[PDB]
Amino acid sequence: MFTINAEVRKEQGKGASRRLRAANKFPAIIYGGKEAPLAIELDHDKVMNMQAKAEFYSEVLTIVVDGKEIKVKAQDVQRHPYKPKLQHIDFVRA
Amino acid sequence: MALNLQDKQAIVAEVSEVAKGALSAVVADSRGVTVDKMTELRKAGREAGVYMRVVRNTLLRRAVEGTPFECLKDAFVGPTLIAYSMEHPGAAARLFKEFAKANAKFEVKAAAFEGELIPASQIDRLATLPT
Amino acid sequence: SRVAKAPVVVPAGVDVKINGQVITIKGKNGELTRTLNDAVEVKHADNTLTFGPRDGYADGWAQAGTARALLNSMVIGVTEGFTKKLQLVGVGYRAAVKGNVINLSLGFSHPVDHQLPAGITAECPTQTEIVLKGADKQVIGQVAADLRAYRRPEPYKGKGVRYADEVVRTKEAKKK
Amino acid sequence: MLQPKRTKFRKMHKGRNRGLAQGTDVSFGSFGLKAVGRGRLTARQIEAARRAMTRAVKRQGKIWIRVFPDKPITEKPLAVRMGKGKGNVEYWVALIQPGKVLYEMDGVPEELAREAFKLAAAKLPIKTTFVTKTVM
Amino acid sequence: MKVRASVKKLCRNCKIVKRDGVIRVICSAEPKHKQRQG
Amino acid sequence: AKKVQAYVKLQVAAGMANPSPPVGPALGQQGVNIMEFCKAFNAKTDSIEKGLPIPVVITVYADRSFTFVTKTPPAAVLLKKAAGIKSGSGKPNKDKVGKISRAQLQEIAQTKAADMTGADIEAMTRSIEGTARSMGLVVED
RNA sequence: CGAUGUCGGCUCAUCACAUCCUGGGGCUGAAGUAGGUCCCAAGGGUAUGGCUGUUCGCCAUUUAAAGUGGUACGCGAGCUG
RNA sequence: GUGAAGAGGGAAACAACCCAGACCGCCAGCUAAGGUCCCAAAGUCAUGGUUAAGUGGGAAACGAUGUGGGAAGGCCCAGACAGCCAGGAUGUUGGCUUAGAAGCAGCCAUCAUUUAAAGAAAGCGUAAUAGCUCACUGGUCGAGUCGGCCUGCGCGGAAGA
Ligand SMILES: [Mg+2]
Ligand SMILES: [Mg+2]
Ligand SMILES: [Mg+2]
Ligand SMILES: [Mg+2]
Ligand SMILES: [Mg+2]
Ligand SMILES: [Mg+2]
Ligand SMILES: [Mg+2]
Ligand SMILES: [Zn+2]
């Protein structure tokens, strides 16, 4: 039921990722095996508060991108070593 | 009652009713029957006075700086809305008996009647009324 | 901000003169003047006083509460005044007031004469305790503090000068 | 004494302390003490903090020491000139990078864990924080 | 007065005050928790 | 506010001290504070006596702080200390008890009166003898 | 290193305060006397002998006290050796 | 790489650091680092904010209602946080090795009701006594308030000739 809007990324690389993370946004990825992987960026604090709920990895999420609704499932997450911040999450279409 | 300046009108003034408190009358009759609501208050004015009123404030957070001067006799009376009444005019007079007579005259309910005051104790129904 | 947002009523016709920012009040028992901190503007609403911080001073909200408390204390004092009572507990302590000069015998070697600031009256109904009444709270409190300061209460027998309503904790000789 | 036995080589290079920690997550326990600083951390110090850890509960719970020194540290003796060899080892430290989960534990209330972790952080030499297990 | 570099509320009645740019603890219960500096 | 209303009996059976084991979370439901038994049950009461029951007026108020008064042991058990028996009621024709002194009984009743009320403590005294007879503890002159 | 004379003593000092005394305060397991500890304070003051080259240390007797350090472990174009 | 074997401008002074490699002259101009209130040429420039410490213009662990900002909380008109309240229900002389502990040493650890507040620790001192209060609910004057997380800039920590 958790629904997050998100804007497609335009720049990839360490520099672009760090520039995003310095503006309270972190990148992420949508893939589904038989579908073209999609780069995405999504707001940091909204999903960080979504994180506390144990249902985040349990239920099916709804990602909104340029007016498109897709249903996905959180695959994995990598976090900052010491601060409670996220660099990047992995999403599987489902 | 619109704001906390009207929250005000309920944070000491019944100190005047609780300073010399010598009875505890409680009842859970949420039935707001007009005939009985000029029965009980009129009897209060007929025997004791207008000191007691219709404030049915009973949630778990109301009556400690409720009656703060005496009367633990109410101190554990707090389920779903239960009216409260004290009695000044003549220590331990007979308000409770006519309250019970109205209960005989079909007040709906009275949650956990215990003969509140002058057992200094539990359930007993206040057998003696020392007027 | 609540104290500041609480206009103080004015009794029967105590004289009130706001000449700029130096409020003067003339009660039936006294007269008191006080220049206000520039951050506050106080207006006479024909039965009371209202307080407002001037724009440009970040401390106005805190300062105005002090101003309201101060003017309330002033109006109370010039209405009827304040009174502080001290007890000289301990064998060998005596007190007596002549004029505005209070002689204390707390037993050092010599009696101690204290001069009052001339607006504060003193009285001694019983010889063991003193009652001093004043038209201004800060000064009556200061003079009471000075009277206490000569022999502040020793916490071992309660001996010394103390306020009436202040209760001293004692202590033990701990062996004998 | 929290010291390795049968070490392959008696003495080890000073090395460098660089990069981010590996075991950043809490795995065995429910509450962990994650280091947000950097720097070596001596087996004597781990012993002190572990004693404080089991002392805060006085018996309770399960604890895990996720950091093992396995790094000999040599000290040149007093009043001896430089050179003429490399001094003998004197103590063993663990190189700690930011994010490493030093202490881990479960079986006690979270607040009691907060207190115990504070007590041991008082003995530790680098900045720490309290972290809880996450679903990941 | 304990003149210490880490002041803390030693009991329930301790109060923290910043008097003239320095941090102090005053307790009305016992005159032994009085702290300074910090 | 809270003077006294809602009165039952707690304060379970009586030997030696320091709370913890027997009667816990039953109290533990609602809030009487925690170590409240070592300033009228390890630093105020007993050495009037060390084993058997007494009634103690025990309670904390809404801010969870204690204060106590005393009472006198009920005659069901106080005469166990007085006469020193381990017998009891249930078989009066098979297991019965011997006599007890009236001066001792009046001493017990004097403690009773000091630790209770009643308009005529002498008129109330004989009820202790009656209770002794009802439980089968013979009290005589 | 085509020289930068040294341990201790004598005379003369001077500065710092992390105060030995005197001064002002808290807190006390501060009855009082006497203390313990901590904070502020550098104005002034801060032994004499026996032993040893000794600084020091030990001893004897005082004193309100016999402070700790810096100054080329002050001071040999000032002395002694 | 620079000095050695490199002058010039900057960092007060300062072979190595920053900029830049002096053929000579010129009372011409544009720039580099670095700066523009006065010493000393150039902004007492413009805009939006931060700090109250002379921080700037030395220094940590640790401590704190300093202050600015962000996100999410509980709690509340079945009315919140603090004021005054009065604060003090009981089969316990609990299995303690039944010499002394008897609402606050070590103990073993946890049966309930009446039933708005009523969980065998928190402190003052008494071989051990009494007595008062805090983790707590609330009747008038009260509403925005209670405690945490992320942070920016600050405060103490901070004593030498
Ligand atoms: Mg001052
Ligand atoms: Mg000093
Ligand atoms: Mg010489
Ligand atoms: Mg080269
Ligand atoms: Mg050069
Ligand atoms: Mg507060
Ligand atoms: Mg600092
Ligand atoms: Zn305190």
mmCIF file with all atom_site columns, C-alpha atoms in Angstrom, chain C residues 13 34-35 40 49 52 71 74 81 83 95-98 109 113 115 118 124 131 155 160:
data_model
loop_
_atom_site.group_PDB
_atom_site.id
_atom_site.type_symbol
_atom_site.label_atom_id
_atom_site.label_alt_id
_atom_site.label_comp_id
_atom_site.label_asym_id
_atom_site.label_entity_id
_atom_site.label_seq_id
_atom_site.pdbx_PDB_ins_code
_atom_site.Cartn_x
_atom_site.Cartn_y
_atom_site.Cartn_z
_atom_site.occupancy
_atom_site.B_iso_or_equiv
_atom_site.pdbx_formal_charge
_atom_site.auth_seq_id
_atom_site.auth_comp_id
_atom_site.auth_asym_id
_atom_site.auth_atom_id
_atom_site.pdbx_PDB_model_num
ATOM 1  C CA . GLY C 1 13  ? -8.160 55.426 41.379 1.00 0.00 ? 13  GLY C CA 1
ATOM 2  C CA . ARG C 1 34  ? 10.209 52.918 37.255 1.00 0.00 ? 34  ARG C CA 1
ATOM 3  C CA . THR C 1 35  ? 11.740 53.442 33.810 1.00 0.00 ? 35  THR C CA 1
ATOM 4  C CA . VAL C 1 40  ? 8.195  47.243 25.916 1.00 0.00 ? 40  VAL C CA 1
ATOM 5  C CA . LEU C 1 49  ? -2.393 48.147 31.360 1.00 0.00 ? 49  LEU C CA 1
ATOM 6  C CA . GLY C 1 52  ? 3.637  44.856 23.795 1.00 0.00 ? 52  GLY C CA 1
ATOM 7  C CA . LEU C 1 71  ? 4.029  46.643 37.344 1.00 0.00 ? 71  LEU C CA 1
ATOM 8  C CA . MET C 1 74  ? 4.097  47.849 42.004 1.00 0.00 ? 74  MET C CA 1
ATOM 9  C CA . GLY C 1 81  ? 1.924  47.021 50.457 1.00 0.00 ? 81  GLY C CA 1
ATOM 10 C CA . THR C 1 83  ? 5.091  42.692 54.835 1.00 0.00 ? 83  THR C CA 1
ATOM 11 C CA . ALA C 1 95  ? 15.753 43.202 68.428 1.00 0.00 ? 95  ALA C CA 1
ATOM 12 C CA . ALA C 1 96  ? 14.266 46.669 68.663 1.00 0.00 ? 96  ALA C CA 1
ATOM 13 C CA . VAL C 1 97  ? 13.550 49.517 66.233 1.00 0.00 ? 97  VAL C CA 1
ATOM 14 C CA . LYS C 1 98  ? 13.885 53.234 66.997 1.00 0.00 ? 98  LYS C CA 1
ATOM 15 C CA . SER C 1 109 ? 30.611 41.693 70.751 1.00 0.00 ? 109 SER C CA 1
ATOM 16 C CA . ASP C 1 113 ? 22.541 49.059 64.037 1.00 0.00 ? 113 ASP C CA 1
ATOM 17 C CA . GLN C 1 115 ? 19.581 51.733 58.750 1.00 0.00 ? 115 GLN C CA 1
ATOM 18 C CA . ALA C 1 118 ? 13.620 55.231 54.745 1.00 0.00 ? 118 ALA C CA 1
ATOM 19 C CA . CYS C 1 124 ? 8.482  44.534 66.910 1.00 0.00 ? 124 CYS C CA 1
ATOM 20 C CA . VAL C 1 131 ? 7.852  42.739 61.108 1.00 0.00 ? 131 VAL C CA 1
ATOM 21 C CA . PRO C 1 155 ? 21.749 24.253 60.141 1.00 0.00 ? 155 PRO C CA 1
ATOM 22 C CA . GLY C 1 160 ? 20.079 32.737 63.721 1.00 0.00 ? 160 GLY C CA 1
#
